[PDB]
């Protein structure tokens, strides 16, 4: 599961590789519910977390609602909520393994966005809040000459009627 | 007659911002002659022992343990002379930041 990277919902996460009913250790023998998808973190917002969770179960769990198609390239279908997933499969599943890692943007995320997801690469930026300035006074007492530049809209001379 | 020079104005040494006041970066929190209030989180220390806010937030005043610098000889000596159960406490002034560091805005969907 990718905890950060969902463009629409903040409280939701992405699926990348879901494979259930693993006999013992043979992970390749178990049926893959969600095909593997490479990490695609945005260029601006970096350092997303990707977590492999391993659950041990008792019964042979069968489900048709959490199944994904073979392409599985739709971000609306690849929207997960581990809370609801564990609420659905709480009777048999119990989490026993965990391994999480950080991942940032590289030169393959543009390829993953264009070829696989059929999208345009979204680029973000870490903007900062604007600097605070007090209420501009009519007669700024003993203030430097640069007081009038803190409240300038643009550094371009504006000739009103001339 | 004999007593001269006793005329001098007050230096206005006091506490400017109280607990709960929303301050900005650079706002002087309190001025003092001797160390009465000690700076804590996001509170700087001028060379005149004045306290100013380094971030924009809410001012708070707490009582917290005092671990001095191992180079300040007087304070280290007082520390080592204290008994086995004594712990120095001081009044610290903090600024709890309210505004986040920044947001991630979409600039171009190429």
């Amino acid at each position: 599961t990718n905890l950060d990277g969902h463009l629409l919902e903040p409280d939701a996460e992405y699926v990348h590789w879901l494979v259930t009913n693993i006999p013992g250790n043979r992970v390749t023998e178990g049926q893959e519910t969600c095909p593997y998808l490479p990490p695609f973190p945005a260029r601006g917002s970096g350092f997303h977390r990707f977590a492999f969770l391993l659950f041990k179960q008792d019964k042979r769990i069968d489900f048709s609602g959490d199944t994904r198609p073979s392409p599985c390239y739709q971000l609306a279908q690849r929207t997960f909520h581990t809370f609801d997933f564990y609420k659905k499969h709480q009777d048999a599943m119990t989490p026993a393994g965990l391994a999480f890692f950080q991942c940032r943007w590289d030169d393959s995320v543009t390829r993953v966005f264009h070829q696989l997801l059929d999208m345009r690469e979204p680029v973000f930026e870490f903007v900062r809040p604007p600097p605070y300035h007090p209420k501009q006074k009519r007669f700024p007492h003993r203030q430097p000459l640069r007081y009038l530049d803190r409240y300038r809209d643009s550094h371009e001379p504006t000739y009103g009627i001339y | 007659s004999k007593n001269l020079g006793g005329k001098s104005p007050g230096k206005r040494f006091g506490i400017k911002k109280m607990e709960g006041h929303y301050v900005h970066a650079g706002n002087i929190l309190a001025t003092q002659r001797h160390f009465r209030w000690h700076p804590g989180a996001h509170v700087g220390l001028g060379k005149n022992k004045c306290l100013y806010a380094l971030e924009e937030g809410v001012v708070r005043y707490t009582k917290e343990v005092y671990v001095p610098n191992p180079s300040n000889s007087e304070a280290v000596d007082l520390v080592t002379r204290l008994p086995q159960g004594a712990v120095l406490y001081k009044t610290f002034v903090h600024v709890v930041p309210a505004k986040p560091e920044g947001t991630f805005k979409l600039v171009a969907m190429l």
């Binding site: 629409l8 945005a42 350092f47 977390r49 950080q102 | 991630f104 969907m109």
Partner: peptide, 23 residues
């Protein structure tokens, strides 16, 4: 348009290590 093209410009990164790693 493309159903996957929804961006919601206000991107929220709930990772507590994000800004620390970004310095």
């Amino acid at each position: 348009p493309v159903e996957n093209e929804a961006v919601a410009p206000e991107f929220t990164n709930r990772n507590p290590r994000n800004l620390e790693l970004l310095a």
